[model samples]
Target: NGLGKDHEILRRRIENGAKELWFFLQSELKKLKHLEGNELQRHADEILLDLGHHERSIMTDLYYLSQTDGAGDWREKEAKDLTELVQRRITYLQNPKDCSKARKLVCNINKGCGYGCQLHHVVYCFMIAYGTQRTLILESQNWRYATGGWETVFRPVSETCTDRSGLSTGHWSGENIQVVELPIVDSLHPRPPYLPLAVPEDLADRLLRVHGDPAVWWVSQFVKYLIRPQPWLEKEIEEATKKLGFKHPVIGVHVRRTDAFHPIEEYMVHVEEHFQLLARRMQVDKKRVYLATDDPTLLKEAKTKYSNYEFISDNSISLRGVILDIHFLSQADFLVCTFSSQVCRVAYEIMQTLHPDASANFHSLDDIYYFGGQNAHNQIAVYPHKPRTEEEIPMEPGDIIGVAGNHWDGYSKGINRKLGKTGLYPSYKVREKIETVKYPTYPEAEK
Candidate 1:
């Protein structure tokens, strides 16, 4: 570790590697003799004086094991077992849900966010479900997501969901377990808060209930492992691969536009930057890139502007097309795009898991958020953030609103009560209220 050794992120990775092995060698380390003395302990504290106790766990086992006798055999067994355990655990996590389990957390996806945002929240719940030995479900038929068509692709979440409107619907209150509905969920920290020192007393109890923790790096890995793309989603992308001829050194670019943030010309520059970076690394022409975006016109515009390069993209608004975009990006050798586009963010999260190398060349629009023509005409506002225009409407507290096409600055789309026109509204002003859709209108539940 020298001047170039000054990299802090890599240093943390190395530290985590040590702690993981320490955990893997937990039984081996606990049984060691001559390990008790402060002589060994003193040297341990000195190794990573830069990190805290939870972090230093990784470094401890390597040092302490060397001090005791038969350390090699112990280390050998630890290595062998850990190698086998990781593979086994991952494969186990990959298997389809086992609904036969004793416990169940009946989840009703009333649809807060759309597909990608849904995954962000759902994956968090899946981790909790996995840890508590509780299988989960989306109460549908009786209830369903506001945005439907989920069952066309993957296995079902729940067949027994209800709208909770039926009177005296018989169910179990026999108390083999407990039930609770949550407004929001908390995330786990890999660094143990209640460890040797420095945990907030208020949070310590909350910390203990989470499925994943130590907030360590691998927990991020585990979240990815918990989700598997449905066969149809992959099968559809496979068709595009054949038609489009996606090849390696292929860089995946997702530009979030239309309603979100940033101008078209601004994002086109980003596409070229990603292309050049990919070209340099893969030793291929920048023309060989897969650019995925919300708007089709940009693809045509980009083709004209970047005449030297070839861009592969599907310009469709279908949901399947949306997923195909994600799958195409996942296939990239590396990714380039800005954040705030949940499309890019979700794609990167999946890329990080499915292919570490695919996520390598990440690019951003300097964290810029752009508002487009979607809401320009509707400049209607609540709490009066955007300029009040003639078409704008004054919103009452109880009035329902449509999210106009234009939005930014942490605002959401809401139609003005007075104008009945969609425009930007403060994000915290109100949220989606999932009114019950009665049966006959309930989505046809798939088996």
Candidate 2:
């Protein structure tokens, strides 16, 4: 009767799919942990060997567990069966039923969105957590319920099915958030101070101005923020880097084509033009373009238009491919991108916050030809500041140039024809469509 009933339960589960079935088993095994007691009760029926009166001593040596198998191996095997008898002593002070706990500052991705959208929210929340004491927690079970697109809470290749976004740095996780997702508060603003030296009080004030009489456009001023590949996904990147085999001076190009970017032909033109100009400055092979994108049809169309360059693409189906692309993108010598994209913007911020000089070297396909950001990543006069050229061609209004350096202190570098027109201009000389104060781009972190 017992065997028949258990078999029927498993038979019913076969309809749930292999993934769900495997997780169901793992979920049960995760309950093997125990904190205390039961051991004394079990001792009441403890077995003693026929070898000797001092059987406990004989058991330890005869077991010889490490590299030997002996007759007493059963003792060692039974001892190991518990696997993990874990924690809970903290409950003495704070019971789950107790009241008056401190406020929990929770952060998470936007559920039901693409990995990129969730990631965009992650960055905004990471900094928000950094600026406040609320420990960050990644959402779980969200992707399972999401309507479409890589619908899983974590990357497919890991134990938790979730990558540790903030966990790699050892800044947050484990006993920190108490083992699972925390309830989220709508806003972390209107609170006490946190991380002054890292962000400074003035900037903190600006950051918290989410709601005031006048809007505080501080986020665009470009303060530092980061989104790292969880260590879990490191090997996935290694695999991609191996597969792409990009020659040095790899340029990461992120192109997102969707509803916001209708009139797609002009958008592609901006992307390719920026690529051509930047290709010259960096001396990169025009064919060496590594493109990370969402819309594959756009990728197909791009290959046709830009005949000079070979567009390399790796658009993986789930989080593994999306994240692996961004990890590779962050290490790029130069990045050409767009703002209308969620992942591109996240990659832009990571590059800017972590490697600004190269980030300044970023080319905005949207901004240069569309978003009015040409002044930042694409503007220059006729002059020289670094790697002096023979002589620069003189410039006039409507002259095409790309910002190429951080010269004359706060002055950015720009060159023409991708030629040697290394000119210097007040970084502010070129401006964006939306006006925001300029913070000098930070130098790249030392090798």
- How many angstroms is residue 262 displaced in model 1 relative to the true structure, after the best TM-score fit? 2.2
lDDT of 2 by residue, 350-389 (tens): 4533321222446554432211111234443333333234
Q: Which parts of model 1 are misplaced by more than 4 Å?
A: 1-101, 140-149, 156-227, 258-260, 278-281, 357-360, 366-447
lDDT of 1 by residue, 154-265 (tens): 4444434322322222232222453323222332323111111122233223332321121221223433443445687667667778788777767677777656466656
The reply for model 2, stretches above 4 Å from the true place, is 1-103, 110-112, 144-232, 262-286, 353-356, 365-447
User: Least lDDT summed over 10 consecutive residues: which range in candidate 1?
Assistant: 437-446
TM-score of 2: 0.43
**What are the TM-scores, per candidate, against the unseen true structure?**
0.48, 0.43
